[PDB]
Design a protein around this ligand. Structure first.
Ligand SMILES: Nc1ncnc2c1ncn2[C@@H]1O[C@H](COP(=O)(O)OP(=O)(O)OP(=O)(O)O)[C@@H](O)[C@H]1O
Length: 124
């Protein structure tokens, strides 16, 4: 089985680009990261920062999670992110996405020893 930490890296980390590469970014990335395999995942965020910087967020500002748990943390600095959101023309297996670039604070849930990001909660 894929670990929850590995799943977070696959679904949410893209350190290779500093921002949204192009208008095609989300279509390519959602496919290549296996996020359109069983259905079109309707929304997903990629973070363009190093793994170390995103793992560091687990010792930053503790905030309530959307599900009511207390294991969420908000980055003190803004981070470069790309939001992918499913379009109207999008029909499985031909999933289609709009690509938005932003610089926002991220909120992740952390678990484990070592204590690492496992879920992306929100950006603010
Ligand atoms: N506070 C939390 N700590 C750990 N896991 C959480 C927390 N809040 C939500 N989750 C997990 O997030 C998931 C809900 O998101 P969903 O399954 O739609 O997307 P995903 O493919 O799991 O990727 P992501 O979790 O990053 O959104 C559930 O698996 C849930 O267990």
């Amino acid at each position: 089985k894929e670990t929850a930490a590995a799943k977070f890296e696959r679904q949410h980390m893209d350190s290779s680009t500093s921002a949204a590469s192009s208008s095609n970014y989300c279509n390519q990335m959602m496919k290549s990261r296996n996020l359109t395999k069983d259905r079109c995942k309707p929304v997903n965020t990629f973070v363009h920062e190093s793994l170390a910087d995103v793992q560091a967020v687990c010792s930053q500002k503790n905030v309530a999670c959307k599900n009511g748990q207390t294991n969420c943390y908000q980055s003190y600095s803004t981070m470069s992110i790309t939001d992918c959101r499913e379009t109207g023309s999008s029909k499985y297996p031909n999933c289609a996405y709009k690509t938005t670039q932003a610089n926002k604070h991220i909120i992740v849930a952390c678990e484990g020893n070592p204590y690492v990001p496992v879920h992306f909660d929100a950006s603010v």
